[PDB]
Design a protein around this motif. Structure first.
Motif, PDB file in Angstrom:
ATOM      1  N   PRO A  44      91.416  12.488 104.975  1.00  0.00           N
ATOM      2  CA  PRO A  44      92.816  12.365 104.532  1.00  0.00           C
ATOM      3  C   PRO A  44      93.475  13.690 104.204  1.00  0.00           C
ATOM      4  N   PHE A  45      92.705  14.745 103.938  1.00  0.00           N
ATOM      5  CA  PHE A  45      93.256  16.012 103.486  1.00  0.00           C
ATOM      6  C   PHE A  45      93.326  17.055 104.596  1.00  0.00           C
ATOM      7  N   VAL A  49     100.291  15.380 103.932  1.00  0.00           N
ATOM      8  CA  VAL A  49     100.630  13.981 103.716  1.00  0.00           C
ATOM      9  C   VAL A  49     101.869  13.641 104.526  1.00  0.00           C
ATOM     10  N   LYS A  53     104.828   7.985 107.528  1.00  0.00           N
ATOM     11  CA  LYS A  53     103.712   7.166 107.977  1.00  0.00           C
ATOM     12  C   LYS A  53     103.122   6.376 106.817  1.00  0.00           C
ATOM     13  N   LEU A  54     102.982   6.987 105.657  1.00  0.00           N
ATOM     14  CA  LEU A  54     102.441   6.317 104.478  1.00  0.00           C
ATOM     15  C   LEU A  54     103.494   5.521 103.721  1.00  0.00           C
ATOM     16  N   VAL A  56     105.982   6.349 101.610  1.00  0.00           N
ATOM     17  CA  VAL A  56     106.124   6.699 100.200  1.00  0.00           C
ATOM     18  C   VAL A  56     107.382   7.548 100.060  1.00  0.00           C
ATOM     19  N   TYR A  59     107.591  10.491  97.420  1.00  0.00           N
ATOM     20  CA  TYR A  59     106.446  11.381  97.260  1.00  0.00           C
ATOM     21  C   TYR A  59     106.879  12.810  96.930  1.00  0.00           C
ATOM     22  N   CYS A  98      97.223  14.913  94.679  1.00  0.00           N
ATOM     23  CA  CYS A  98      96.655  13.616  95.007  1.00  0.00           C
ATOM     24  C   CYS A  98      96.478  12.759  93.761  1.00  0.00           C
ATOM     25  N   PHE A 101      99.982  11.681  92.209  1.00  0.00           N
ATOM     26  CA  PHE A 101     100.737  10.625  92.868  1.00  0.00           C
ATOM     27  C   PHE A 101      99.978   9.307  92.878  1.00  0.00           C
ATOM     28  N   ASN A 102      98.688   9.343  93.201  1.00  0.00           N
ATOM     29  CA  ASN A 102      97.926   8.125  93.432  1.00  0.00           C
ATOM     30  C   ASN A 102      97.225   7.593  92.193  1.00  0.00           C
ATOM     31  N   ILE A 108      91.318   7.420  96.987  1.00  0.00           N
ATOM     32  CA  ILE A 108      91.666   8.711  97.578  1.00  0.00           C
ATOM     33  C   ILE A 108      91.422   9.833  96.576  1.00  0.00           C
TER      34      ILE A 108
END
Ligand SMILES: CN1C(=O)c2ccccc2Sc2cc(NC(=O)[C@@H]3CCCO3)ccc21
Length: 129
Positions: A44-45, A49, A53-54, A56, A59, A98, A101-102, A108
């Motif tokens: 993922p990294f 980001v 596509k995600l 968000v 973000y 990361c 946000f998550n 993740i």
């Protein structure tokens, strides 16, 4: 609703330092980043980001300074760092983005923590300035 636009990509090719990190260190950190890139928890990294596509939209409102492994590798190659501590700073920024946000409890974020652990372990061997 729309959120904030994607910030300009790094490095700012307009403010490189004339005294980057000596080649011996730069070569070590580059090999360290490539090692992390081969970690399966680094998938993922690998790239920035993708907020579309995600899906968000906000973000970049929360993460005004995105970071990822390919940006670190590019900042080493294009000679944007002055000090190995700035490499560590950017890695930490990627991880902190990361978690911010998550949430610290997201899967993740565990992956972020794991590749940070690998990175720090490898960095124990960085040559002196
Ligand atoms: C670090 N990070 C994130 O921080 C992130 C940010 C917002 C929403 C989800 C996530 S998890 C995540 C997923 C991908 N990428 C993927 O999941 C790939 C591409 C789309 C689905 O598989 C890349 C980065 C990322």
């Amino acid at each position: 609703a729309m959120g904030a636009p994607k910030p300009p990509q790094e490095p700012d090719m307009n403010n490189l330092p004339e005294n980057p990190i000596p080649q011996h260190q730069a070569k070590f950190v580059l090999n360290t980043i490539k090692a992390v890139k081969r970690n399966r928890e680094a998938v993922p990294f690998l790239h920035p980001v993708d907020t579309v596509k995600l899906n968000v939209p906000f973000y970049y409102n929360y993460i005004p300074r995105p970071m990822d492994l390919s940006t670190i590798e590019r900042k080493i190659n294009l000679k944007a760092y002055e000090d190995v501590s700035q490499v560590v700073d950017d890695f930490n920024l990627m991880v902190k983005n990361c978690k911010k946000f998550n949430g610290e409890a997201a899967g993740i974020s565990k992956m972020a923590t794991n590749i940070q652990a690998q990175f720090e372990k490898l960095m124990v061997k960085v040559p002196p300035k």
